[PDB]
Write a protein that binds this DNA or RNA. Structure first.
Ligand SMILES: Nc1ncnc2c1ncn2[C@@H]1O[C@H](COP(=O)(O)OP(=O)(O)OP(=O)(O)O)[C@@H](O)[C@H]1O
Ligand SMILES: [Mg+2]
Length: 468
RNA sequence: GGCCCCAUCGUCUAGCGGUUAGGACGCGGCCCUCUCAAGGCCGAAACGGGGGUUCGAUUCCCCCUGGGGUCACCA
């Protein structure tokens, strides 16, 4: 069948680039009724951020991706955390050693630097050490690394499923270290070994690994294993076209969730990063994505992550994809984070309904609708100017309002329109100042619905403070 | 700099030899209207350059230019 995977490195916040690559591996497997594996790349004890594994796994679930095998769901070929597979890599490294495909190198980190300075890059000088001497210096515990012994001279054919064949010159392929001196392996060794054992057939990864591919082709050869298919996705780019980074852009998935972006929206935007539906439709579900997926419709340009477009999309989900009730539920955390409270579900729902077309992120709701949940709301200078300029009218309207029995949006409009005509003035001249009194703002939803929402008492009370 | 990838509006993109080069975000105008949005309508905006192949190239081939990636005991 088809088996894909993601090899996240727990070395920082959950990265949007990871979600992007995960999105495509997930789809390709589901499209082919296959498996989607999650393997953690925690072999660099130096860059390892404790607490990063949980975070990445949660973000993937947050976006709606589900994996078939992984650290927290088990699987037939575990462990799924490389740190727990160390003896395995040791074993395979020595296998290459015995097959003449690798060798032990004892240069100190400082000699290597000096070698890189003079001859630019390691010169494979350790290949001249007699195997028995290397084997002996190893048993004496001399610190060392194991390097891939690249066939020299020569050529190595790599095949990218989206770009075609690419012939490399072995002189371009360095004798990369396979097993570090601390016993930990490098991506190069662990990638191949683990992809093999877990049976992955389709390796879909970021284009930044294209050049390292001939190293993997060589390793699969060394082991006598069949190489999987390679699909390299273009890198997500900052606005300046450089690979998306933490300083020119927002790469942390937690930042997106914190800002009120809907996972559905983010996932949908990410699909547009290199892929498009035949009919050119831009809003679609995760499932529709799986079904319509085809490497034929994947573009290879480095897409710029456009926040403005994400916001647009998020707003689109808020008002056209999720139900009223769903938005109401998703907005709660944000109200709580703003120290605000709603009186009941009924109230919140109507509040959300009135604002639906006015907020593009869940975080924006408590901001623009603050006056619907607390008395502690701000008053814009323009609102104040408008309030003071219409006090006389409001003063004459107030008595009519305290005597209004039927407190409905229909009745209220009738009264106000009538009052405006009877006072020989345009509605706006009575509605605008009233809006200011009620909301401390001049940018709000319809006056009649805002006036009704609160009820007679709550509305008059607030109206009285503006006239006091 | 060496090697490798990429090339349609500012951005995401549709073209797969013959199209007024389409859509979306953003931007401007208009409509709707009690404000602000949402929504509808209209509009400005692209094939980097030079050779070719071909009756004909944005579509196919080559060079140039441009952009990006990669050159570790990180991935
Ligand atoms: N900036 C990025 N843009 C696009 N894809 C990325 C990016 N970074 C990583 N990927 C891809 O997403 C998957 C997960 O990458 P990973 O979890 O290692 O994050 P990372 O940003 O590569 O961190 P590290 O510094 O360890 O390389 C990979 O298979 C890799 O190809
Ligand atoms: Mg045009």
């Amino acid at each position: 069948m088809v088996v894909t995977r993601i090899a996240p490195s727990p070395t920082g916040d959950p990265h949007v680039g990871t979600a992007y690559i995960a999105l495509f591996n997930y789809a390709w497997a589901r499209r082919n009724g296959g498996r989607f594996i999650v393997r953690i790349e925690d072999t660099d004890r130096a860059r390892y951020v404790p607490g990063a594994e949980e975070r990445i796994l949660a973000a993937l679930k947050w976006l709606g991706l589900s994996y078939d095998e992984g650290p927290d769901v088990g699987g037939p070929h575990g462990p799924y955390r490389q740190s727990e597979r160390l003896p395995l890599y040791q074993k395979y490294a020595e296998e290459l050693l015995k097959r003449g495909w690798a060798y032990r190198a004892f240069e100190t980190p400082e000699e290597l630097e000096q070698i890189r300075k003079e001859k630019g890059g390691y010169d494979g000088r350790a290949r001249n050490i007699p195997p028995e001497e290397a084997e002996e210096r190893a048993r004496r515990g001399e610190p060392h690394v194991i390097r891939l012994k690249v066939p020299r001279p020569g050529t190595t054919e790599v095949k990218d499923e989206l770009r075609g064949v690419v012939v490399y010159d072995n002189q371009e392929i360095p004798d990369v270290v396979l097993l570090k001196s601390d016993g930990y392996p490098t991506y190069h060794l662990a990638n191949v070994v683990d992809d093999h054992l877990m049976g992955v057939t389709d390796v879909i990864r970021a284009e930044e690994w294209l050049v390292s591919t001939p190293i993997h082709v060589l390793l699969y050869r060394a082991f006598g294993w069949e190489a999987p298919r390679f699909y390299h996705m273009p890198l997500l780019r900052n606005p300046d076209k450089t690979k998306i980074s933490k300083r020119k852009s927002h790469t942390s998935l937690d930042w997106y969730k914190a800002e009120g972006f809907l996972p559905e929206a983010l996932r949908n935007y990410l699909c547009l990063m290199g892929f498009s539906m035949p009919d050119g439709r831009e809003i679609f579900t995760l499932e529709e994505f799986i079904q319509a997926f085809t490497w034929e419709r994947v573009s290879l340009g480095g897409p710029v992550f456009d926040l403005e477009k994400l916001r647009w999309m998020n707003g689109k989900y808020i008002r056209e994809v999720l139900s009223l009730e769903e938005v109401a539920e998703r907005v709660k955390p944000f109200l709580r984070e703003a120290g605000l409270s709603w009186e009941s579900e009924a109230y919140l729902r109507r509040a959300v309904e009135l604002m639906r077309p006015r907020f593009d992120t869940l975080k924006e709701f408590p901001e623009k609708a603050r006056y619907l949940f607390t008395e502690d709301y701000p008053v814009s200078e323009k609102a104040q100017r408008k309030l003071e300029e219409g006090l006389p009218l409001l003063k004459e309207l107030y008595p009519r309002l305290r005597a209004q029995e039927e407190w409905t949006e229909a009745a209220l409009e009738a009264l106000l329109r009538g009052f405006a005509a009877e006072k020989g003035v345009k509605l706006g001249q009575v509605a605008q100042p009233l809006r200011a009194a009620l909301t401390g703002s001049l940018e709000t939803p319809g006056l009649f619905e805002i006036l009704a929402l609160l009820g007679k008492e709550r509305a008059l009370r607030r109206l009285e403070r503006a006239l006091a």
